[PDB]
Enzyme design. Structure first.
Site, PDB file in Angstrom:
ATOM      1  N   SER A  60     -64.466 -16.267 -14.555  1.00  0.00           N
ATOM      2  CA  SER A  60     -64.963 -16.217 -13.184  1.00  0.00           C
ATOM      3  C   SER A  60     -64.164 -17.175 -12.272  1.00  0.00           C
ATOM      4  O   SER A  60     -62.961 -16.971 -12.056  1.00  0.00           O
ATOM      5  CB  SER A  60     -66.460 -16.534 -13.183  1.00  0.00           C
ATOM      6  N   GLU A  98     -69.327  -6.232 -12.966  1.00  0.00           N
ATOM      7  CA  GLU A  98     -69.127  -7.552 -12.398  1.00  0.00           C
ATOM      8  C   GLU A  98     -69.933  -7.902 -11.135  1.00  0.00           C
ATOM      9  O   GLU A  98     -70.151  -9.082 -10.856  1.00  0.00           O
ATOM     10  CB  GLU A  98     -67.630  -7.751 -12.083  1.00  0.00           C
ATOM     11  N   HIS A 130     -71.548  -9.937 -15.402  1.00  0.00           N
ATOM     12  CA  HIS A 130     -70.613 -11.029 -15.203  1.00  0.00           C
ATOM     13  C   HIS A 130     -71.203 -12.201 -15.936  1.00  0.00           C
ATOM     14  O   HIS A 130     -72.344 -12.565 -15.655  1.00  0.00           O
ATOM     15  CB  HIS A 130     -70.560 -11.363 -13.709  1.00  0.00           C
TER      16      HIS A 130
HETATM   17  P1  LIG Z   1     -68.068 -17.240 -11.156  1.00  0.00           P
HETATM   18  O1  LIG Z   1     -67.697 -18.628 -11.427  1.00  0.00           O
HETATM   19  C1  LIG Z   1     -68.091 -16.582  -9.436  1.00  0.00           C
HETATM   20  C2  LIG Z   1     -66.728 -16.620  -8.747  1.00  0.00           C
HETATM   21  C3  LIG Z   1     -66.819 -15.971  -7.343  1.00  0.00           C
HETATM   22  C4  LIG Z   1     -65.463 -15.808  -6.567  1.00  0.00           C
HETATM   23  C5  LIG Z   1     -65.425 -15.109  -5.166  1.00  0.00           C
HETATM   24  C6  LIG Z   1     -64.135 -15.290  -4.326  1.00  0.00           C
HETATM   25  O2  LIG Z   1     -69.619 -16.725 -11.417  1.00  0.00           O
HETATM   26  C7  LIG Z   1     -70.304 -16.800 -12.670  1.00  0.00           C
HETATM   27  C8  LIG Z   1     -69.912 -18.027 -13.424  1.00  0.00           C
HETATM   28  C9  LIG Z   1     -70.633 -18.008 -14.777  1.00  0.00           C
HETATM   29  C10 LIG Z   1     -70.112 -19.220 -15.631  1.00  0.00           C
HETATM   30  C11 LIG Z   1     -72.190 -17.943 -14.572  1.00  0.00           C
HETATM   31  C12 LIG Z   1     -72.781 -16.953 -13.562  1.00  0.00           C
HETATM   32  C13 LIG Z   1     -71.858 -16.814 -12.355  1.00  0.00           C
HETATM   33  C14 LIG Z   1     -72.204 -15.627 -11.441  1.00  0.00           C
HETATM   34  C15 LIG Z   1     -71.629 -14.241 -11.883  1.00  0.00           C
HETATM   35  C16 LIG Z   1     -73.708 -15.592 -11.172  1.00  0.00           C
END
Ligand SMILES: *[P@@](=O)(CCCCCC)O[C@H]1C[C@@H](C)CC[C@@H]1C(C)C
Ligand SMILES: *[C@@H]1O[C@H](CO)[C@@H](O[C@@H]2O[C@H](CO)[C@@H](O)[C@H](O)[C@H]2NC(C)=O)[C@H](O)[C@H]1NC(C)=O
Ligand SMILES: *[C@@H]1O[C@H](CO)[C@@H](O)[C@H](O)[C@H]1NC(C)=O
Ligand SMILES: [Ca+2]
Ligand SMILES: [Ca+2]
Length: 534
Positions: A209, A341, A449
């Site tokens: 992510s 996702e 996700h």
């Molecule tokens: P990511 O770290 C979200 C990144 C968004 C970028 C947009 C420009 O999200 C996930 C991290 C994970 C460790 C737990 C749940 C998080 C969301 C999908 C809710």
């Protein structure tokens, strides 16, 4: 018992966890507190000689994911939780949080020269810490495979503390502080990992992510120059859900609006120099002001308040342009996605139920998008509930007439199709891509996700074959096929190539497929990438 003598002559002691040896909480930078706030990290100058490193240190300050200038129940409840003494006890956070963790197979010694897997956590660039991503599952499997690796994790600043933007930050040369933290840790690995038994020349960076988009940013950093003291900082990268960041420059419109909002919130709306005013407010005041700007789960969703933005200096341009222009490090990469996702993000706009509302939400979210583009987007992603995410669930999961649609758009732009764009322009080295459908049939969210974190760090499943085994073989031999999996993982050349180009995962196991889905959305979105930047 476990011991290591660092590159400056200090001998530190770690912990023996039986199944592995760990050195947790090693400070790699001077605490970014006071006037050092929002500023680039300063190398840690001090002595660790004689110190024991047996516990994870606190995480950097966290932002309420439901935070916003508005007031509501989700915000109120999470705040209640986050400020609880019990929470403050089990998950401590602090501005003094720049530490690094080294975990290895038992009995590893200096000179072992094992490949290194450097973990960069994800948390929407607003929350997150190293302590919640246990390395044991990966380490144990590596040993069992006869391909032992050393796991390294680095804390970095998040939210306002690590990603403040705007005119003042730009003028000062302080953009993307959180990425700079990650960069320093890498440099620390180059200089010290050998003392732990790792090979500084066999480093593979990986994250999920926000951590994955962080990996892409590292591939793009300094126009692709990834060397330190003459040698590359990493020989490969694995990106789990996330590629280029779709964002405007640091001194762009939203970067500045957010800077001003935060400044008003901390009581600096009247300062002639708002930045100097912000360095003076207490941690409490700053944590408060920040929790009054949108969190990643708030209505704003993908249009994040804090995230990596091109600064014209370390990330010289629009991240899509850099990839088109060949300004990246030439390394073999693995980049994959989970089938659904965007279902988490789609939960943020469940009050958007009609098409007229869907059109205005997109318009609010993508300020550079013309009506024609908004209309093309809404044709590429129709209201037809059978077409949205969770994909292939027919008329189920209809929380609202727009949930599946909004979930489909957000997950594609931010990850799934963004990945294809990268894959189609990247020529820096061999590419391997995967698409997971392991949790097909899970109500509301589908193959969501984050689910890979479970099967990489907590539970074993069909997916662990990829998240652990395949990832371990790639870090060791630069080919995931050395894992001896029954399904051969094909090289990805282009999304238009004939034959399967995707490793795929379902509840029973592995199989291969094609990366040819949602082509209309791909062109709706990526024909002119900057139209959908935040
Ligand atoms: P990511 O770290 C979200 C990144 C968004 C970028 C947009 C420009 O999200 C996930 C991290 C994970 C460790 C737990 C749940 C998080 C969301 C999908 C809710
Ligand atoms: C869905 O909820 C959001 C969040 O409350 C609504 O947007 C806010 O509306 C208030 C009142 O007009 C404004 O002061 C805020 O600026 C809006 N918040 C944000 C983050 O933009 C939104 O209007 C609602 N949408 C629908 C379709 O009802
Ligand atoms: C950022 O860019 C400048 C100019 O090229 C360079 O000197 C500096 O060392 C870079 N920062 C990092 C963390 O690499
Ligand atoms: Ca301003
Ligand atoms: Ca090049």
């Amino acid at each position: 018992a476990p011991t290591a003598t660092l590159a400056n002559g200090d001998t530190i002691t770690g912990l023996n966890a039986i199944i592995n040896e760990a050195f947790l909480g090693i400070p790699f930078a001077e605490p970014p507190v006071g006037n050092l706030r929002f500023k680039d990290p300063v190398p840690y100058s001090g002595s660790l000689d004689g110190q024991k490193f047996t516990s994870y240190g606190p995480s950097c300050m966290q932002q309420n994911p439901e935070g916003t200038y508005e007031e509501n129940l989700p915000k109120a409840a999470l705040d209640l939780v986050m400020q609880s003494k019990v929470f403050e006890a089990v998950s401590p956070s602090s501005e003094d949080c720049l530490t690094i963790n080294v975990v290895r197979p038992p009995g590893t010694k200096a000179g072992a020269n094992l490949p290194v897997m450097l973990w960069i956590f994800g948390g929407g660039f607003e929350v997150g810490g190293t302590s919640t991503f246990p390395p044991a599952q990966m380490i144990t499997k590596s040993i069992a495979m006869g391909k032992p690796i050393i796991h390294v994790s680095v804390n970095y600043r998040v939210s306002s503390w690590g990603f403040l933007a705007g005119d003042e930050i730009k003028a000062e040369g302080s953009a993307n502080a959180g990425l700079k933290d990650q960069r320093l840790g890498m440099q620390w690995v180059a200089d010290n990992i050998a003392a732990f038994g790792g090979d500084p020349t066999k480093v593979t960076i990986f994250g999920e992510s926000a951590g994955s988009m962080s990996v892409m940013c590292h591939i793009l950093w300094n126009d692709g120059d990834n060397t330190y003291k003459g040698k590359p900082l990493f020989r490969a990268g694995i990106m789990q859900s996330g590629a280029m960041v779709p964002s405007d420059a640091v001194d762009g419109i939203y970067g500045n609006e957010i800077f001003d909002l935060l400044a008003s919130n901390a009581g600096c709306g009247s300062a002639s120099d708002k930045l100097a005013c912000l360095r003076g407010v207490s941690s409490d005041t700053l944590e408060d002001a920040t929790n009054n700007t949108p969190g990643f789960l708030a209505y704003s969703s993908l249009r994040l308040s804090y995230l990596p933005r091109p600064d014209g200096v370390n990330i010289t341009d629009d991240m899509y342009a850099l990839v088109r222009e060949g300004k990246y490090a030439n390394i073999p990469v693995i980049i994959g996605d989970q089938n659904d996702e965007g279902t988490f993000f789609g939960t943020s706009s469940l009050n958007v139920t009609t098409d007229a509302q869907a059109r205005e939400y997109f318009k609010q979210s993508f300020v550079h998008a013309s009506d024609a583009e908004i209309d093309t987007l809404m044709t590429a992603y129709p209201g037809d509930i059978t077409q949205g995410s969770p994909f292939d669930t027919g008329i189920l999961n209809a929380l609202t007439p727009q949930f599946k649609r909004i979930s489909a758009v957000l997950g594609d732009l931010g990850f799934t199709l963004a990945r294809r764009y990268f894959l189609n322009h990247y020529t820096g080295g061999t590419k391997y891509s995967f698409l997971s459908k392991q949790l097909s049939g899970l109500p509301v969210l589908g193959t969501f996700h984050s689910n890979d974190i479970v099967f990489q760090d907590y539970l074993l499943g069909s997916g662990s074959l990829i998240y652990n085994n395949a990832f371990i073989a790639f870090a060791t031999d630069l080919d995931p096929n050395t894992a001896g999996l029954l399904v051969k993982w094909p090289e990805y050349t282009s999304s238009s190539q004939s034959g399967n180009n995707l490793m795929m995962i379902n509840a029973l196991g592995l199989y291969t497929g094609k990366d040819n889905f949602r082509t209309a959305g791909y062109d709706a979105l990526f024909s002119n990438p900057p139209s959908f930047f935040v």
